[PDB]
């Protein structure tokens, strides 16, 4: 029935992302975890890496489908027959950008409804960017990542 | 059958609220528009008045059920077999309070998932309180309220 | 001849308000400092008291006219032939409310253009309410108020 | 010997407050937990009740002294020979008010330095007011309050 | 009499900018629409392009003058005998930066008064950046731009 | 007794930084002013320059020690036996990032307590970035910098 899309760069997927997509799967029949292919900011992991890490970290969720996309998110959501756009809501500065993005997406595809989900307090203060920056400077980010992601990030930063 | 609850004081229900509940009905099979008694807010309209205004203003939506309540939110949602709690997200200062509410409601009922919807730009700068204050100075608030609500607010202040 | 109106509760007028209206008079030919009755805020000073305090505190500014009003803002501005509505912008939480006000006032009078001015850093962290609360505990608020206002606040709390 | 004061209404003291004062005692030699009378907030508990609840809830901390006061903050801090004023920082809307408070307190006592501490994520979304409102609807607030405070809030609402 | 300056990068000018400058022209006798020449972020359109697009899109407003500048804004405003600085106010995150900018401009030129105008709800959630990003990824931004700007942006992205 | 660290990039140190570190020295027995060595954003002044400018501008404060560091801040604070982390709090957008940073630092080193100090109203609206940008475009930033820093910045921008 209800098809939802949860897009992002997921570079890499964090426990914050797992919390959001898990909540989405309890609400909607099918959830597409949609990984943006060619972000303008050179992602740390390749698209194939981000997709494979996210598949592994969500494999326990029956109704998640991990797919990469390079179109405008709204164009891809339209072609996937999604009517729900999942966005994670952490802090107020996130909120301001999300409101601009949501109004633009509504202009581009009014039949796509943006829904904002709220993560656990546990993940309410992290981001892929902060995690990467901490790990790059020899900080412990084990608590923030799925184990498979933690292993790949160590491997990535070792070289 | 996905059951969602949209709680609030709705004193009175505005077009902003109609926007949110309409989006909700497009997403979920059954939506309970749930009117909190909220005596501490000293509402302008009684709970029975607010319930009847919202019933009339949502009557065109097949899958809306308007109910009044004075229970703890989490208990009322459990008792209505809802697993989704809808809140409208206007501006940053609302957002902060909503996070406290949602984290409190999650603590009390972890299977009740809060979802925030965003209203049209048309209603992004109004509130029940602002409309009431405009009407208190006899300003034209027809654009912001359902007809039946507009009349009742007029009659109330006359 | 450009006419601007600077409305507010001004209970009491502070140096922050003096800063804003002074900037306004440097920009526009005639500035109406317009004191809202605001009975719902239960002001400390009566409208007549607030009007006289502001008259005295702005008397050095040639092109300020102090007036009290209880009308709808948009009507009073239309009736004063103003096309500019001045508001002071302090912090983010004020900003959110001001946008709702300005969008409401624009809806009711689209030719009334809201302009926001920014006060000196010196007054960017005070408000009428904060000063009153300090004075209620006999703290020194001479730095934040015009002399005549300081005296009246003293006399009031004595 | 560094003396710090942690003022607030503490109506009632929550685990969020316990978190802050505990962090304070790890940083400063002596911490005065100072309970403002705040009659304008119409507190649920009397000053004497709030003082006794906080005394009991902080009794395990050797270097906490609980005191009630109705003075101007700056005077009470001067009179207690404190040079540090502790405030907890939750969210953006608190932050704005705290800056106004700290700049006012600095004006009145420039040697009183405000320091903001950040509570655990566990308490980052609660407040005395939110807990009271939950308890008013008989929701379970045991997780948010010290045992003695939880009992007193129960007894009060019974 | 009263000379006002409305500076920005206008890369490209949007309907949000037209709304602001139009409101400014109803308030002040002469409005200089001032286009910053060499922003550090390589603008999509050249200065000559931005100026010509803005001239065309404001030609109906009698008391607008479109000019490019490369000095510090305050230095240019001083040399132009402007005493009013028009800033558009969209959302709270804009506001924080605008307050820092306005206090700096006041330090640099105290006789230049910053005034913040508020755009229509219609344009309260867009920016040149978001519009460009949407258009670059094959989204429809026709509603946000003057027709002449829409034509030039399509031409720009076709190559 | 109590050792506090005040880290940053200090590129260059401003009067806002002097205000904060001065308040810190009145509160804590020893204050390490810790200058991050290799920020990802190519700092205007070298690490040796930033350290020498900061030493000169704080030389009047007896209990300040200026040191450079290249580790993760928390790792350096741990190795320096600091238990207080001084952060300066200017505006709400600062606050949101500071909360994420403080929670991360608490995860990485729970015995390091973050404390937020508030600067004078005089410096509540400036940053190293805005000062640099103004100076680079021929604006007067004399009021915002220690004299030694003002001299070095002019020298830097002359070439
Ligand atoms: C209906 C209330 C009274 O129920 C509560 O339990 C409660 C508890 C604490 C604060 C506020 C509330 C209210 N609330 C909860 N969630 C949505 C709402 C309402 F404002 F729409
Ligand atoms: C003067 C009031 C009562 O007039 C109104 O119409 C109104 C309508 C709704 C909210 C608030 C208001 C007030 N207001 C409007 N604009 C500025 C102000 C004032 F707060 F300065
Ligand atoms: C205790 C009060 C009454 O003391 C004042 O002087 C005052 C003055 C103005 C506003 C608010 C206050 C209160 N306050 C100051 N600093 C912390 C607090 C308190 F809220 F914890």
How is this structure best described in words?
The structure is a homohexamer. With 159 residues, chain A is α/β, with parallel strands linked by helices. Chain A has a single domain, classed as HUPs (Rossmann fold). Chain A contains 6 helices and 5 strands; from the N terminus they run βαβαβαβαβαα. Chain A has helices spanning 15-27, 47-58, 73-79, 92-108, 128-136, 147-158; strands spanning 3-8, 30-36, 64-69, 84-88, 113-117. A 5-stranded parallel beta sheet of chain A has the order 3-2-1-4-5, with helices on both faces. In chain A, β2 (30-36), α2 and β3 form a beta-alpha-beta unit. In chain A, α2 packs antiparallel against α6. The longest helix of chain A has 17 residues, at 92-108. Chain A is globular. Chain A binds chain D through residues 92, 121-122, 124-125, and chain D through 91-92, 121-122, 124-125. β5 (113-117) of chain A pairs antiparallel with β5 (113-117) of chain B, so a sheet runs across the interface. One ligand CWA sits between chains C (7-8, 36, 72-73, 101, 104-105) and B (130, 133-134, 137, 139). Chains A, E, F: One of its GO terms (molecular function) is pantetheine-phosphate adenylyltransferase activity. Chains A, E, F: Substrate binds at residues 9, 41, 73, 87. Chains A, E, F: Its EC number is 2.7.7.3. Chains A, E, F: Keywords: ATP-binding, Coenzyme A biosynthesis, Cytoplasm, Magnesium, Nucleotide-binding, Nucleotidyltransferase, Transferase. Chains A, E, F: Belongs to the bacterial CoaD family.
